[PDB]
Amino acid sequence: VTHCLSDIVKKEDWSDFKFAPIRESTVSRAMTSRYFKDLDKFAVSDVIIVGAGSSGLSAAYVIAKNRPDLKVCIIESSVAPGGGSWLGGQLFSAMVMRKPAHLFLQELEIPYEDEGDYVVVKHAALFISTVLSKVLQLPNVKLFNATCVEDLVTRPPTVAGVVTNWTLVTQAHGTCSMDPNVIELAGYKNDGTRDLSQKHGVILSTTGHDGPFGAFCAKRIVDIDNQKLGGMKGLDMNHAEHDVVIHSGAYAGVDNMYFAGMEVAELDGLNRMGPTFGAMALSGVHAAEQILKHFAA
Amino acid sequence: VTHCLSDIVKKEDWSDFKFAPIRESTVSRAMTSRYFKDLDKFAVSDVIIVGAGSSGLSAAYVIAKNRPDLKVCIIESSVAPGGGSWLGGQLFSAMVMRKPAHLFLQELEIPYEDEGDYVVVKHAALFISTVLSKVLQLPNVKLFNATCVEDLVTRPPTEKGEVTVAGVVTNWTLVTQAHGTCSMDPNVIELAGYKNDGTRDLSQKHGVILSTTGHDGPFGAFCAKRIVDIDQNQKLGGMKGLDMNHAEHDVVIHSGAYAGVDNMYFAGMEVAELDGLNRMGPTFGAMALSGVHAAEQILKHFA
Amino acid sequence: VTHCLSDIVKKEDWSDFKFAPIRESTVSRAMTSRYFKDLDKFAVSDVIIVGAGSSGLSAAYVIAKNRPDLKVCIIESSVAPGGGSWLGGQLFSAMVMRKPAHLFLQELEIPYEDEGDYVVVKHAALFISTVLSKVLQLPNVKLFNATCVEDLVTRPPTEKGEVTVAGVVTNWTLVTQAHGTCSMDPNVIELAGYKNDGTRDLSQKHGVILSTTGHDGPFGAFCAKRIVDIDQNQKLGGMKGLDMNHAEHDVVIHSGAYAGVDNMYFAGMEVAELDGLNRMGPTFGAMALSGVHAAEQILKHFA
Amino acid sequence: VTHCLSDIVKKEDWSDFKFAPIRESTVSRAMTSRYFKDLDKFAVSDVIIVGAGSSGLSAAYVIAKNRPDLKVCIIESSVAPGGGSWLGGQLFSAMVMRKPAHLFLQELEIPYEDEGDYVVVKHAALFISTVLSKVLQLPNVKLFNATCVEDLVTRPPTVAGVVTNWTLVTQAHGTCSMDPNVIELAGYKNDGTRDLSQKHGVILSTTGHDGPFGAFCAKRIVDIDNQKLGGMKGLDMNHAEHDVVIHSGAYAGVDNMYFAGMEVAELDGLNRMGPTFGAMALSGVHAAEQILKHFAA
Amino acid sequence: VTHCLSDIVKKEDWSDFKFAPIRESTVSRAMTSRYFKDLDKFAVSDVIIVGAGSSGLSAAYVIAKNRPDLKVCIIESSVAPGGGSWLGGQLFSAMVMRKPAHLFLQELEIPYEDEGDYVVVKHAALFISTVLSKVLQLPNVKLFNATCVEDLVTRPPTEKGEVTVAGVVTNWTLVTQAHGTCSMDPNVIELAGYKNDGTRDLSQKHGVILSTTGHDGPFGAFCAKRIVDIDQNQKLGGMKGLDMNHAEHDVVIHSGAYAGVDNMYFAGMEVAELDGLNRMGPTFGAMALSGVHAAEQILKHFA
Amino acid sequence: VTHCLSDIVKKEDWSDFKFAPIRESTVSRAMTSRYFKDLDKFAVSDVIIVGAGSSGLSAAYVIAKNRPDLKVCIIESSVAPGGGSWLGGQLFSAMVMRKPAHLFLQELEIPYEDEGDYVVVKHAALFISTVLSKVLQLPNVKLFNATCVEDLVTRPPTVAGVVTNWTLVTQAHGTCSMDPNVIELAGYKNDGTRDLSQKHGVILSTTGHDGPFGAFCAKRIVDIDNQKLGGMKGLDMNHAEHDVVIHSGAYAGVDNMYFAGMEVAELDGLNRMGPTFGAMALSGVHAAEQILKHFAA
């Protein structure tokens, strides 16, 4: 039997095992210094992705892989990212993805079972953990998990950033009050006005349809903007997956604002697809394409 | 600007995009058929790992990588696996691991920042997502997430002790969390080693349970408490104060075979609860390496 | 009618008013940079005070005023500090303090009504807001509010006892209140006195914990219970009935160094829970003066 | 080592320490007598301030300091006053105030760190505790904390007072029922009609935007009055802080009614500012100016 | 068709009806002034009755009717007094009382149906509303409803026992129910018998507590549990099974002075919890008569 | 010392005390037989009063005292009747009643403190317990407490009864489902049609403004009927108490339907009065007058 310590630990009872000694504050400072550096670096971001589910992570991979220089800030309200992609339907495991979504799986080197017009990843968790791993390895991506977007930063008749807090704080806003923080989009001067020498940053909202804060940016934009929440319709896989992919990308009516995933179905009043995931990944690819074109222009 | 569909979607507006058509029942049947196959195949398992946190997943990797033929059944009560390893401390990100835990990171190809006597993974999420990915790709590993162990399957006492494990009693976590409120029976996952009359077959290797359910949360230290509750010759030590030097050392050394019960193994913070050890707070080297230690003992059992 | 802007706002409708312009990220960075500096500076503290109620804040004032060079780290689980001192009894306002506690009020310049053997501050809120203001102005005091102590950092037993304190284990209170529900690790604040290998440096003064977490609420008497839970040579006395004469006397006298644990101090109603003393109800002289007593002992330790 | 008892306690073990003996009822009566005197005195008030957060307390200081003769009744639903000013953003400590808000800090002798166009108070708690201390020391200010305004006292087509209860009672109104009390504004006779020989009292509502009873008086006035709740818009510090300060003061459509703080943003549909506090203090100053002018006329 | 306003309202549409005018503050001051007078007058009481249920209210009537000069202070945690006597069993109405409890009904002029060995009040609500009405009319009785006893005021041990009662610790019930969640101090109500230095005045009759808090609900058997919790020479018997013959007999006989504590009395179902007696279910004769028995002993104390 | 047992119990230790022996089932049957007799008798009622608070009980007394022959069915959702009349305001005790409400107190022989234009009952609980006692003593009044009205029984374009359940069942309707019972008004045949030889029964709804089921019949009538819920306005004692008394009685738009108490303020959009109780009692008297006239015609 062989493992990473086979050459270092020679006693069967592991009596010769040891860690190098440590002081508790060394650990605290190592963590906190790095988190402040993140908060400082990403206080102005090029791309803010709200929601690290299948659509948001798929988009994050394509964006960051193509433009490793861009600061991609991912805000995820739950402790565990991945949203609704840890399971298939009814607590079962298998993740069905219709072709050509398998081309995304090949790119990420995610194995699957080919069934002709669709493929199956043997566990939804395998897809999402793989995408997470690959996204997180990229140099200018930051995952702020346990952190919720509570509002939008705006400028008079565009988005200009997001308003953030610890999720557990947001969930206690009903119950002394606790202010949020802010993450700003690229493109402004120290007087708060537009700097046209800079490319404007963008928000991609991929907060799904479900859960405590589902379809968050859609509701807030509708709350402020002429626009109404379409409302997700009944389940119809052929029409739902097609429309979600096609409708994903730039939002008409607000500048520098993008959507993907099931949030698009809520906003545009499209069908839903239930336990199949091709459109989540590919809507992320589509949104990412449009976002990458914005930064190339 | 290139991506996986660049060769087949040529319209800027994606108007030429399409999925192959589908019928809803095809998707349903594709999912359900597979889940039953899993339930049928793993109804008798060689290794049952309770809790897919850092220590459980680290152990799973070492076991399954070394013995890809063993049925390794991972039961995880939460929807998302990974337990307490998606964050560092106080909702911050960085994962500190003391050397020699960095050798495990090297094996898994997880990048880190070397600070001398310890290293830092830039996000805890990077560690746990990577281990998950590599574990789940193995051919005889199954993750039953959203599924809780709520009791042990046992056989009567022997010379080895009062408690003799033979499997776990399972349910959907959401069902378990409603038991206090018409009642809903559990399922069972059995360990290898028994005949069709329920008695031991000594020609067969007995399966094992590795419990790695941590110390915290709704079901923390589950198997430790159940074993103590069944056998009053044993007691819960109770996790003591934070002391990184002593806690990480002791958790690693004390992980593995549990003295009073046969075919029963522990790793991670559940060991600290059971043996009354110190805790270490936001450092993770002992979680990975206690899993490695338990895995070694389990592999030797099957050798 | 005059106010701070009378010289720069001349329009009755304030149409000539303006702020200097600002960028949102400037504000964010101004806040976050400072909080990290605090976390870095106080990661090793000289005095850790658990609970910013009347007794904790009174102690903090005496300690920091006498020794402004000491890092005095105040951990308070609630958003608003002040604990039980924003009101008198039954939601009424007046704060009764028996003499000689009025001498403390004089030092803090808190006005009161003299009734002979006792005095009355016209609102409890006036006492606690004033002490808070004066404490927070001191240069090496830090208030980490919305932050809970959920465990102790320890070192192995010595001749001084079973429990040896070396810091506190911390988290955002809202996280602590969710532990029963993916798990979230704590942070640590360490006491002065240890080297980079985690062992004691006898050339350095050991830091101290003063626990003043009261008797009531979600985390009442936290350190008393944790110390009792770790060392079974000690037990929780349990707060007895209301008896103002005996309760206030005993709480003041019993406050200070805890007999069984080194570098550990108590004041306020937590002392009553630990030593099994009477309670006093809506009178506050013993809270302030027990803080003074504990502060004296702590200053002597550092002298 | 020296403290307030160094000349009175001479034993190291404090064995010579003693309190003067007391009877429990002496303490009870001292508290209750004073609270009834308060209830009696302030049953008719000149200024009722609803909400003791940054804006309400800032206004209370300016009003009471300039007119120490006026009965200023502060109603605060929480046990601890101070509202949302015990923290900065995301549970961090520092309180950023843009100039000229620093002139308010100088007046209250609150130390700060000067950063050019803005200043920083090292802990939000230092600002709010200092203002509280200074406000509470004034002779005709009363803080009724743990007490909630549940409704308004009115007279046919003005405000004439507030309807009060213990907050914990208000929070149980959903669950035998429990009547409120009343606090009346100055200006009426014993038959309940207007006494024009008296100056009419005023309400200043500063109940914020957040929490269990946020924007209370705004919602209730809109409920009764032609007026609609504007609804707080997205975060934009330049426009939010400017407008909140400017819009604070007398409400158009109801006589003797004033607003300040974030309640103004909800009512008038303004932007929000997130974790900066200059407009809270200065909107209170502005409202206080208008209120003081009403009582001077 | 006649009613109280027939002589002053002559219009069929009541258009000539009117109230005398009023100012809102007149009403407020009328209420608050009176409540403070109550708090001031009863701050020292002769008899403190904890719980305004059937047994407490029955005792109150007998005590106050016989000695109208005594300050009888009734503390009731609920908004509505009457405890468990607004209904019979299983939400049905009828109140069964075994003879000789019917003699109490006769004294209170409560009509009943005579069934031989027992009688029936047609609605439990009729019994409890009538006793309430007659009790509240007495000149030195005060009902502090919506007010909970959450502790006892005590003095140090004597020859009479470990626990020596000197009053009760009070708060608004809604505050007490929030203690587990900034902390809120209680008030105090003191028993007659002490001087201004808090010590006993042997020239004065000591006041008494009668606890009648039942067995059930949020604060059931409060004083029994507190007395047991303070003095470990005593234990909670625990209410046993239902046995009407033995339960009603024993509750009546065992009610009155508590053996281990001076100036302390019990009646009703709290006695069953304390002494470990049977329960009786939906019959109420023992509640009324145990109150009578306790009242007799209390009156003899003051005689 | 003398009590009801002084001639029966002669031992100081009460050792000679005894109850006559009993069998547990004797007690059960005595209770249950009587409750079924009530359910049977009142299954058709002449007057159904919904809510046994100050207004409903005041009305019940006047109705039943004048017409002891009428079956008066009082439905009360709480275990304890009395609604909001066990306390004055802010958990204080005193009950202020403006004249001429004192004439009602004299009739019920409730002592009070005369203060000129108003009187004070020393405890609200004294008023409500006295009225309860006197109402419950009447021969054809039944109090079904712990019982909630969940809906109305109707006949096509009138009320014809109420739909009832145990309150604890009603409160679990959100969580296997549990059907209600019915209480019918007098006036119908066994085929369910109107019997014009009989006087139609009436509903008086006095369910207040507050609590879990406040203003129940007002909301349900508005739900079905042309009519809108006025909504209770601000506190103004002079106008509120006058209007509540005047507006109490027959509802225009539904036949055989009456209101009194604060439910009238919700329905007709009137002011509220806070902690004064004259209008509650007198609105009950007014409603009772109209109801008694209906049964006299």
Ligand SMILES: C[C@H](/N=C/C(=O)O)C(=O)[C@H](O)COP(=O)(O)OP(=O)(O)OC[C@H]1O[C@@H](n2cnc3c(N)ncnc32)[C@H](O)[C@@H]1O
């Ligand atoms: C195909 C399947 N079902 C279809 C059907 O049933 O018809 C399905 O719903 C998809 O898996 C959804 O994927 P998508 O990426 O659109 O959203 P979701 O997985 O919920 O991810 C959203 C993520 O967004 C997070 N989130 C949600 N709201 C917020 C917020 N305000 N701030 C930060 N993060 C937020 C949330 O925690 C989650 O991780």
Ligand SMILES: C[C@H](/N=C/C(=O)O)C(=O)[C@H](O)COP(=O)(O)OP(=O)(O)OC[C@H]1O[C@@H](n2cnc3c(N)ncnc32)[C@H](O)[C@@H]1O
């Ligand atoms: C080092 C750090 N902090 C130390 C300190 O603060 O002192 C720390 O606690 C570690 O991250 C814990 O790692 P470990 O693998 O021991 O447990 P955890 O991450 O809780 O994983 C346990 C997993 O086990 C799951 N689980 C818990 N109970 C059950 C059950 N009965 N059935 C199935 N799954 C269960 C649970 O959801 C979770 O995913």
Ligand SMILES: C[C@H](/N=C/C(=O)O)C(=O)[C@H](O)COP(=O)(O)OP(=O)(O)OC[C@H]1O[C@@H](n2cnc3c(N)ncnc32)[C@H](O)[C@@H]1O
């Ligand atoms: C005299 C009066 N009544 C006596 C009686 O009724 O008999 C009375 O109880 C005093 O006001 C209590 O003063 P003290 O300073 O002992 O405690 P408290 O005011 O509860 O302050 C404790 C503080 O400590 C905080 N706290 C409590 N637990 C924790 C924790 N684990 N970590 C951090 N902070 C904690 C808590 O939020 C609070 O602010």
Ligand SMILES: C[C@H](/N=C/C(=O)O)C(=O)[C@H](O)COP(=O)(O)OP(=O)(O)OC[C@H]1O[C@@H](n2cnc3c(N)ncnc32)[C@H](O)[C@@H]1O
């Ligand atoms: C600048 C910052 N954030 C801006 C942003 O996020 O965009 C911010 O929100 C300010 O700190 C708010 O200050 P403001 O004084 O407007 O309100 P707040 O601090 O909530 O104080 C309101 C006070 O009013 C109290 N309160 C609230 N409602 C009531 C009521 N009905 N009766 C009595 N008191 C009440 C409440 O407890 C609290 O103390």
Ligand SMILES: C[C@H](/N=C/C(=O)O)C(=O)[C@H](O)COP(=O)(O)OP(=O)(O)OC[C@H]1O[C@@H](n2cnc3c(N)ncnc32)[C@H](O)[C@@H]1O
């Ligand atoms: C005979 C019947 N059933 C017997 C059986 O089922 O076997 C039965 O239980 C009797 O009705 C009980 O009468 P009793 O007077 O003992 O108590 P109860 O009616 O609960 O009245 C207690 C009162 O006491 C109150 N209370 C209870 N605890 C407290 C407290 N700590 N402070 C103030 N008041 C308190 C409570 O609200 C209540 O009103």
Ligand SMILES: C[C@H](/N=C/C(=O)O)C(=O)[C@H](O)COP(=O)(O)OP(=O)(O)OC[C@H]1O[C@@H](n2cnc3c(N)ncnc32)[C@H](O)[C@@H]1O
């Ligand atoms: C004057 C004072 N305050 C004025 C102000 O604040 O402005 C005040 O509100 C009065 O005391 C109210 O008297 P009223 O008789 O109108 O109602 P209330 O005492 O709530 O009685 C209603 C009764 O009706 C009951 N109830 C309420 N809903 C139902 C239902 N659906 N079925 C049966 N019973 C019901 C409820 O339990 C209660 O006992």
